[PDB]
């Protein structure tokens, strides 16, 4: 052990397309690491790049085929499973 870490969060992103639903895209980002030490969750959607970033570790880019806004973006973090559900 010299430069190995376990406190590093390992997220896993899953993407799913929906047609005719309240959401057109479902994105699943769960935290699955040996340990990981998440602090806060401050996601934000930048219209400039049309990307919804979760934290300064990973960002979720939206396809330009979809019109997405802060009012359409549904972000819910379940602590029970340490999973972050994104519905757009």
């Amino acid at each position: 052990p010299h430069e190995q870490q376990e406190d590093v969060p390992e997220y896993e992103v899953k993407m799913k397309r929906f047609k005719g639903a309240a959401y057109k895209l479902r994105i699943l980002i769960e935290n699955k690491a040996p340990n990981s030490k998440p602090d806060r969750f401050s996601p934000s959607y930048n219209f400039a790049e049309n990307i919804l970033y979760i934290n300064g570790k990973l960002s979720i880019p939206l396809p330009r085929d979809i019109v997405v806004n802060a009012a359409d973006i549904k972000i819910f973090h379940i602590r029970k499973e340490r999973t972050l559900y994104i519905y757009i």
Partner: peptide, 23 residues
Amino acid sequence: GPHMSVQIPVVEVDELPEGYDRS
């Protein structure tokens, strides 16, 4: 350019409300 970015409020729930698709 269109330098507009908005923060999205995240709700920390134990699961999504009815109507959502959870797996």
